[PDB]
Design a protein around this ligand. Structure first.
Ligand SMILES: NNC(=O)Cc1ccc(F)cc1
Length: 330
């Protein structure tokens, strides 16, 4: 089997991407944030504290003939940005782009933090990291990909995110028309539960590539590219007027600037992030200072290849017995 679904930016900055997901019988379609940096599929629901729902589409398990309460099970998660949610657990039929999993754990939110309430476009998350990070207690549950894997034509999914445009998540096959050149594959460590890999270095603009190992995670659920302070300082030093602002919370630059590209290494291959991808617009409405899309990972504890990096590539998440990541230009 295979599946293919379009993913769509939630706003004009590509802050996140939403993908329609069918849950239950008859189908209830919710728009979920596919997150390769977590492993819970959770949704706004009929059980979510009413005051914490503001415009989201909710899952109503009592209207699904295939919903089943997982007795006594609970879940609770917090994310890198400090947001969080928690609740109880159902299993139900879940389809993504024509690909169906029966008995998928669908984690129903009782509580969500303010950032989720305030984002009316995101109805939940669908985690695609390794199932070892799943937060269901007392018994951890499998991700949609893990459940689907044995049925897939190939044990893979791909992320093809757009720049200010829709893109695609495919399950079970690699669309050889969706990228240019070849896909370069690179080793993955699953020891921390993430799609963790080592980039072979970077370049700023037209500068010479610096060979240096950069461990990080491929994370579709993170907006920006977070890299060591050394790397990030070298990038912004090439932008006139750029500076790190503690009050804003990162590097800012004059909105009138022409940003250089940023290249990261995948083995002997190179992915070039155009300068425009690194502009995240005015720091506040009407400001002539703009927020940068490459920021320091110092304090996070890990480097994160978020959407700014991933949208420059066609990315293969290979869930074979020994997982790997593939990157191609497009
Ligand atoms: N969905 N991604 C996140 O919540 C960001 C993140 C991941 C791992 C980590 F160790 C720190 C932050």
């Amino acid at each position: 089997s295979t599946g293919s679904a379009t993913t769509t930016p939630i706003d004009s900055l590509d802050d996140a991407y939403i993908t329609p997901v069918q849950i239950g019988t008859p189908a209830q379609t919710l728009n979920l944030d596919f997150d390769t940096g977590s492993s819970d599929l959770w949704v706004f629901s009929s059980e979510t504290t009413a005051s914490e729902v503001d415009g989201q589409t909710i899952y109503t398990p009592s209207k699904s003939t295939t919903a089943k309460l997982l007795s006594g099970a609970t879940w609770s998660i917090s994310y890198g940005d400090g947001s969080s949610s928690s609740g109880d657990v159902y299993t139900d039929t879940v389809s993504v782009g024509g690909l169906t999993v029966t008995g998928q754990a669908v984690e129903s939110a009782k509580k969500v933090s303010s950032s989720f309430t305030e984002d009316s476009t995101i109805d939940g998350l669908l985690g695609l990291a390794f199932s070892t990070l799943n937060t269901v207690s007392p018994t951890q549950q499998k991700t949609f990909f893990d459940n689907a894997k044995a049925s897939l034509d190939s044990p893979v999914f791909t992320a093809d995110l757009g720049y200010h445009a829709p893109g695609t998540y495919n399950f079970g096959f690699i669309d050889t028309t969706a990228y240019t050149g070849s896909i370069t594959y690179t080793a993955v460590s699953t020891k921390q539960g993430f799609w963790e890999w080592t980039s072979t270095g970077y370049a700023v603009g037209s500068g010479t590539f610096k060979s240096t190992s950069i461990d990080g995670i491929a994370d579709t659920g993170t907006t920006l590219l977070y890299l060591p302070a050394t790397v990030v300082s070298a990038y912004w030093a090439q932008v006139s007027g750029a500076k790190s602002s503690s009050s804003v919370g990162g590097y800012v630059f004059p909105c009138s600037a022409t940003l250089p590209s940023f290249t990261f290494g995948v083995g002997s291959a190179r992915i070039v992030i155009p300068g425009d991808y690194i502009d995240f617009g005015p720091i506040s409405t009407g400001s002539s200072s703009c927020f940068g899309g490459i920021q320091s990972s110092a304090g996070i504890g890990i480097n994160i290849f978020g959407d700014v990096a991933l949208k420059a590539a066609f990315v293969v998440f290979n869930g074979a017995t020994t997982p790997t990541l593939g990157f191609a230009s497009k």
